[PDB]
Amino acid sequence: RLITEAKQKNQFYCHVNLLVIASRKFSGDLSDISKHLALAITAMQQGEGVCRIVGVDLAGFENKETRASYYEHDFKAVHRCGLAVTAHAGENDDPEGIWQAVYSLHARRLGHALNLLEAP
Amino acid sequence: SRVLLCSAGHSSMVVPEAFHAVPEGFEEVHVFTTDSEKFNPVVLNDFFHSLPNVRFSITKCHGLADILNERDFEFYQEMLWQWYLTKMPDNELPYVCLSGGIKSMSASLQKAATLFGAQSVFHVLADNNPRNIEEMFDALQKGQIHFIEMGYEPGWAALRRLKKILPINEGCSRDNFKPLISKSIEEILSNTGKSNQLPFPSLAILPPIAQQWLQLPLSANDGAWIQNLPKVDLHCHLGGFATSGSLLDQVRGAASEPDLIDRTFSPQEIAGWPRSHKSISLDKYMELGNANGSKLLKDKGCLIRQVELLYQSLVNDNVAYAEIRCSPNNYADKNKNRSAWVVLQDINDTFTRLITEAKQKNQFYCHVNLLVIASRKFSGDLSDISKHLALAITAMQQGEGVCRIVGVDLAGFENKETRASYYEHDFKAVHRCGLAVTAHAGENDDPEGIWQAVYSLHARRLGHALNLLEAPDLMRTVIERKIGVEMCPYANYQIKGFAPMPNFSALYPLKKYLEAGILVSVNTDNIGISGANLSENLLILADLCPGISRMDVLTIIRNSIETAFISHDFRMELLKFFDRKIYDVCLISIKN
C-alpha cells in the first residue's frame, strides 16, 4: 500500500522485498525452522504485489551448535521452489562452516563474514 | 395410557382384583383369553360397565382350546404378541398382570411384557380364593388380598414398528406367522474376541435381545439402521463428489463466470453402475470424474457451491465426522489472483461457516477436517509436492476455527520412483510440524512399498491396501503399530473386482482384516464417481463380506474414530457423543 500510494503521486519510492528469518533457537521447538521455511515457500506464491517474499535468512547463533551443515535436507525444497538463501555469519564463522553454507546450503549471500581473508 | 392386560381362564374374577392394584384405579382394561367356553365374559361385563369411563375389551384366539399342543402354543404366542402390539399405548408402557390361567399363557404374557415393554408386572393373590363379587370385595376391604410386585421392567424401548409393518391381521390362519424373534434367539450362539470387541461401552446397557440382534449377520434390509447411525468418513475426495447428475448441474449453474466453464463435456457411463460387472482401470476411473474438478472448480463460485453441496450430502447421510481430501493447487490460477492458499482458505472458510451456522441452530452437524493431497510428479517439476507440503504446514498454523487441516495425503503412480523411499528429507519437516501422513498405496503395491510407507514416511493410515494377506509380516506390523487402513468397498469393488463380481474369485478381505484386528475403516473415496455415499458403502459389505455382523459395523465406526487425525480431548468428546447417539439409535432401530 505504501509503495503503491507513493507511485500514484509520482514521487520517490523505495521498492521493498521481504526475507523470512529462519531463526535458530535450540531451546526446544526446533520445528520453528520448518515452520518458517514452509511459511516463506507458501508466501512467495502470492504472485502479485509490488512487495514480495524473495528468500529466507539463516539467523540465530552462528556457533557450531546450529551451523549450515545439518539442514541441507530442509533447504532442498527451498531451492526447488525458487527462494534465495542468505546465511548469517557474524560471529565465530569458521571457514569450513562458511564453505558448507556456500556449497551445501547454496547460500547466495553471506551475512558479515569479515574473516574471509584468513582463508584464501 | 395406564392400561391393564390380563389372562382370563376358568376363574375370571382376577380382572377386578388386578384393577384395584393401584390406590387410584385405572383408565382402560383389555383381557386376552383363549377360546374355551369356561371363561365367562358376563362376569367381567357386569363388573365393568358400572364404570363407563373405563374401556374394556375381550379378544379370543380362534381355533385354540386348552393349548395342549406345541402348534397350539406357537399359534397362541403369535396371536398374543400381535394383540399386545396392537393394544400397545403410543407413548407410555402399560400395566400387566399374569396371575390368572395356566403356566403356559402366563409365561407367554411375561415374555411378551419383557419383549414389548410393561410399566409394571404384578401378581394378585388371596387366602380364600374369592369367587363371588362380594367375596373379593370384602377381601380388599379387610386387606386380605395382597399385591405382589417383583420389580419394575423397562422393556425393550423399540419393538413396535412390527405393528406398523405388520397389518392388523384380523383374519388369520395357520400360515401368517412371524418367526422373527425365534430366529434371533436361535442364532444368538448357534455359531473368541468378538465378545470383548465391544465398542462404545454404553452398548452393554442395551437390552440382551438388542445386544444379540447386533450379533446377527448384517443384511441388506438394515438400510434404515445403517442410515440412522452416526458415521465417520476418512477417505472422501472433495472433487469427486458432484461428478454427474443434478448436483453437477447446480454446481455448474452457480458459477461466477459461466462463460469460461465447459458444460459440453460429459463422462462416459458404465452399464450397471454402481454395481458394475466389469473391472475398470484406475486412469479410466479418474477420467470418469473429469466433468468436475480442476477443469471446473477454478472459479470461486463453483468451489463454494461444491463445498456446500458436499457438506449437505455429508450431514444428510448422518456422517458426524469427515476428513475431506482436497488439492488446492488444482483449483488455483494466477489469472484472477487465486493461489492455492486462497483456494484452501475458501474451502476452510466455507466449511467452518457451514458448521458454525448448523451448530448455532442446534442441528446435527458434521465436524469436517481437511487433508491436503500431495501428488508426486503430477505437473512436471517435482517442486509441486514440496509446495503442497509447505501449504499444508502453513495451513495448520491457522489454529482458531472449527475446520482445520490435520494431515497430508500421498499418491505414488506405480512403483519405485514414487513409492515411499525418497522424500524422508521432505517429510522430516512435516513430521516435526505435527501433520499426519496418509498413503494411497493400494495400486497392487509391493509389500516393501507398504513397509516403507509405514516406516520411512511414518504413515498413520493406508489407502485401500487390499493385498496384506500375501505378506503376514506386513499384517503383523500394521496391527502392532495400530496403523489404521481405509478401504472404500464400492471403489475397491469396481476397480479391482470382488465376489460376486462376475468371472472373479477373489473375496473382499475386510472381514479377515477385522478378525485379525486391523484398525479398518469404511469410506467413500469419491462419492460422485462411485455413486454411493457412506450408508450404502457400509451396506454393500453384506455381499462383499458375507457373514459380517452389526457389531462389526459398530467396530468399523469405532476404528474410524480411533484412527482419525484428531486431538485426544476432541477424540474423547467425539467418542462420548458417538456412544450416546449409537445407543439412542440402536434402542430405537431394532423396532423393525
Add this chain to the structure above:
Amino acid sequence: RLITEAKQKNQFYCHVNLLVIASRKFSGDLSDISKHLALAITAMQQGEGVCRIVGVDLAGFENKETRASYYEHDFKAVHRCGLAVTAHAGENDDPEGIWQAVYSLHARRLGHALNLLEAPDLMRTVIERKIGVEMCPYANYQIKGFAPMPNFSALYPLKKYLEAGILVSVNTDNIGISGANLSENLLILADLCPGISRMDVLTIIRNSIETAFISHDFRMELLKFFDRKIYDVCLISIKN
C-alpha cells in the same frame, strides 16, 4: 514351566514375556549391541512356549555420546523381523533424542521420560502416535525427587500425562532396589500425584494392556479376562 504348572492346577498365573536389553558398556567390545540384537532376533524364532521374546530395550547411560541418532542401521533388521523397541530414556533425555527414538528408532514405548511437560510438540507427537511411557513412581521419586519429599517442589507429571492422553503405564523398574512392588507403586500415587482417582488407576492398567508387546488375539483375551477380574474385585470391594 512355572506358567504351565500354574495353569495345570487351574490357579492364578502371571503370563510373562521377555525383553532382551541391548545394553552398552563402552569399556571395549562395542559389538555387544549387535550381539544382543542378533540374540533377540534369533530367540524370537523359538515359536513355541507361553513365554516368548517380544522386544528389546535400549538401557544403559543415555548420554549424548550414545543417543538414538546412530543405530538406525542396527535396528532396521529388528524392525523387519517383528521385535518391538523400548527406549530407556530415563535420564538426560533431550527432546531431540526422544524424537529420534520415536521416529528413527521407531520406539513403541519409552522409559520414564518425565520431562515431556516442557516440550509441547513432543507430547503431541507421543499422544498422536500412541506410544506408551513407562514411569516407575517409586524409582523416579527416589532418583529424581518430587513432592512431598522435603526441599523438592517439582510435581510428578503422571496426572498431567493421563489428562493429556499419554498412554501411561505404572511399573517397578527394580522390585528389590526400589523396595516396592507394583501394588505399592500404584498406591504411592495417592500422595505423589494428589487428586488422582481410582478410575485413573483403571485407566493406567488399561494403558499398560494396550501398550504391551502382545498379539491382537492375545490382547483381546487378556482384555476380556481383565474386565472380568476388575468387575469381580470392584463388586467385592463395594459390597464389603
Add this chain to the structure above:
RNA sequence: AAAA
C-alpha cells in the same frame, strides 16, 4: 399340573 397348589386362582384350569
